[PDB]
Chains A and B, each alone.
Chain A
Amino acid sequence: PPGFLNPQLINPQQAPLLRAFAEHIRANWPQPSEFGYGSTLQGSANLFI
């Protein structure tokens, strides 16, 4: 939904809970990260990453 893509499309006075929920999701959903593994003395076997 475009409103989910951009929460500003939801009027606060008309749909307060939904607007807050979207902003909550967009603000608190965790950020992915990465880390190494294995040993450089061996092949990697990774395809994309």
Chain B
Amino acid sequence: HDRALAFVGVLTQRYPLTQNAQRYTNPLVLGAAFGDFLNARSIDIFLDRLFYGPTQESPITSITKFPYQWTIDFNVTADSVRTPAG
């Protein structure tokens, strides 16, 4: 309950709700970002790419726009993403 509320505060300090309620979150990015957060690891890199337009691409292809090692546990190539299973 502590971590959940804190994570909400971060998500809302950026992206004010009234301007972003309609946007769709990328489940992959959301899962990775949340997992790092309660692992007491910084998550700033993920917040820039929390959303995606489902009518224009998949949650995968939305990520492959940035083909490089985002972080030590989240590595994405031009065609694929590697991460530990939750």
Contact = CB atoms under 8 A, between A and B. Distances in A.
Nearest to B68: A14
A42 interface: no
Contacts of B48: 13-14
Interface residues of A, number: 3
Nearest to B48: A13
Nearest to A14: B66
Interface in A7-49: 11, 13-14
Interface string B43-76: 0000010000000000000000110000000000
A14 B66 CA distance: 9
Nearest to A15: B66
Contacts of B65: 11
5 contacts: A11-B65, A11-B66, A13-B48, A14-B48, A14-B66
Interface of B: 48, 65-66
Interface of A: 11, 13-14
